[model samples]
Target: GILKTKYGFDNLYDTVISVSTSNGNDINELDDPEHTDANDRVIERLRKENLKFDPEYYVSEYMTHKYGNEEDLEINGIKELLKFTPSIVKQYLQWYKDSTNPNLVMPIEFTDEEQKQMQDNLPKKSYLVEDIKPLYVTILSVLFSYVFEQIENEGTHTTESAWTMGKLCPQISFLDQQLKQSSLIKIAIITGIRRALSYPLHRNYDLAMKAWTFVYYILRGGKRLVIRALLDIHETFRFHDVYYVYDKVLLDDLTAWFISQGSENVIRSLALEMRKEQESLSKQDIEFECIAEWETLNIREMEILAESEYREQQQN
Candidate 1:
């Protein structure tokens, strides 16, 4: 027999105790295998019914089964999930798309008339550069100038990161459809470096971080363009002992990144040339010992003395 209660839940006592039964009513009856099987079936049915009312319970068990029995993804990482669920790899692709798409600028509207007006003439009047430049460079210049001036305030009545960033909408919009010239982007990189190094590192921490963002956007946003531009410049000044277009931090990061990238091998030559310089310096700086004419030093010592004074000038 079955019954329903609005508040819900039932475990028939007769059925529970009837695992041992004589017509399920005889108080002396006990121990029937058939009755045990029937009781098990009824309990199984109730659990399934309860599962409908508490879906989260099934979700918990579902997740448990995956981790407890499958253990597929955490062992190899989510990218390996592609091998298991081919149908679900759209999620994997979407994640990659999301990752790559963040390199672009998404414009926002200017809130006030003054900001709108200032933005209108930014290409011509922005004090950031001597000539009209790209939208991104213009934004970077304004931010850099603010940080360089060391103005004190928490952004009021008028100025802030959000508002200043918002002013780029027009420029970003106007520039988005045009060609992205590699040389112009190179200027963005140099300007970012000059601006950030203009102020102390820890003094303008927030703006320092902002300037780096601009540089990395140039550095990362256009891989082919970045490599082309930097490589071309490197060709002009391949190996001078005292060459530094970037600050120590920028130089270190750029050198490390360029070395680790694909088959460019540009800085690798710089390193190779440096090794030749050291070899030459070692030969040039060897001390010579004077010896009597009749008692010359051994051939090994004689070899060192034979090197000409201009040996150092022959470094490759």
Candidate 2:
């Protein structure tokens, strides 16, 4: 995977931002205000370890196991995993479906009985105590609070579709700073998206796409509330290990992706579905989709533009 160098991360932070943002192919060029001055520093370190960065020998020797102790390997694995968009996702998905996959413990879909077992085991509430925040915390926390309240008062059943989180203003407000700005909740939401896709067989692509759309809009500095509300649902279901049911129901589906597939056909499907058009939705277009009322102070006042505009704006 590293052989392909499908994505480049100047540092750990870049990898994290890419987790939330779509357009994986072009993430190498995304700007980050928090960009570390460690590119040369990191490369020097890598050179010391061994310069031959072939995928198998390199990945296996260092990244095969997560002992929870090796920091460099963990970061290395994250970079490789994020490389899954155009081709690696194809390789991994095929490896998963075929019986020839070497490992018995693989990314297999759950059986009907197993799914019931998991459903029964699902906890009604998250054990994570809400993290402490500043007295005058930003609106992101408030939105996070609203989301938790709805999920706690109702359940995944009521707020299954991300739209249930209400509006996009709060969500957009949280991510308005810049694409590279980092937050714990933002990381959690992105991590949830990655976890959702772990089941390559689930075709959770629709669910993953909705989750990706939220980041797509946010990273581009768009102001649509629909994306935010959708992320709210993603965060909730992600917390509960709930899968999206057909018609956007919160219930898990009890079906396999297919009896089988032509490998080329599968690759074609992935390419078509996963390719995000590099286009910007205008602010006027984004606003028409906003139905919820907002206070003047609640919205971002700074100039908002598509992520590419920010790039060109900086260039000039």
Candidate 3:
């Protein structure tokens, strides 16, 4: 579970392209001018149906639940939620775009200048859709090559292992972009890797490495797909304001999913670690020493992140 960030928009776009092409529904499936027309239609459709939901209610609920009653809290809980508005909106926009409803319209309206900017900021639409299958196939081929190389080299890790890892870099980079929040990506990776290690099949060093490699790719691709749906929403709706609302809703959904996935222990542990890290950073300012203990208290950060990621990953 990961929250799709603006940074990872391109990766998400690519995954959708991959899916579309694989299913023979991409622009290339049409001839010449028809392909161009089809591309425009797809892009237009995406924009029109982007994030259509409001996240204020859900975010307010979360803040109230987490901080006791909002009425009792000293801090401006609603304002805090608003601070993450852009991401929140982007998340929900993705969900709306991917939903079964065909009449949903993106909340953002595009100015000519904004559209021009998008032209530069967005990846080439055709290339993203067309390259999906080849990229996955390449990842698989490299993985297989690494396994064979490991066997041939008599259990000694070969260059192929490193090479395979390097090849996975694209996917990793893609995930990094889609999840935008580095901390979340780091936690997810650790949790997934730890889960893999829990399996007896992963006990063999070689097998473990391979399993990890597989996990990385699978998760990466999954993230990429989720991000793609999100980006499609972003592209369809050109307004950052709407994207912000969409993202928050999506994050909430993502967080719910994380809680349901039965990985709360790992998530909570990560949050504690994050709190420690924050405390370490805050310690640089000696003036805050009196509140050092409070400074380190992240409370339910894992739960927050999990909820946030769950909303962002929603597809249906």
TM-score of each: 0.20, 0.20, 0.20
Instruction: List model 2 lDDT by residue over 216-307, tens digit each.
Output: 22222212221233233334444432222111211111011111111223323322232233122211211111112532211011122233
For model 3 the local lDDT of residue 263 reads: 33
Give per-residue CA lDDT, model 3, range 1-316, as digits (tens). Answer: 1332221222232233223335532212112211222234334322321221112333344444444455644343332322222232344456555767533322344457545644554433233233332233222222322332333233354323332332222222122212122353343333222222222111112232333343332222232322332333333223332222222222222222322331323333433443343233311121110132333212134345547865676644
**Compared to the true structure, candidate 2 yields what TM-score?**
0.20
Candidate 1 residue lDDT tens string, 1-316:
2332110001112332232232322211113312333334334322322222222232232233234344643442322221222111232334436674653332223336424432342223112222222323333333333322222222222223222221221111111111132243333333332222222222222333343332333333233333332332232222222221111212122222432432223223322332343233321132222224334232223333333322444453
Worst 10 residues of 2 by lDDT: 253-262
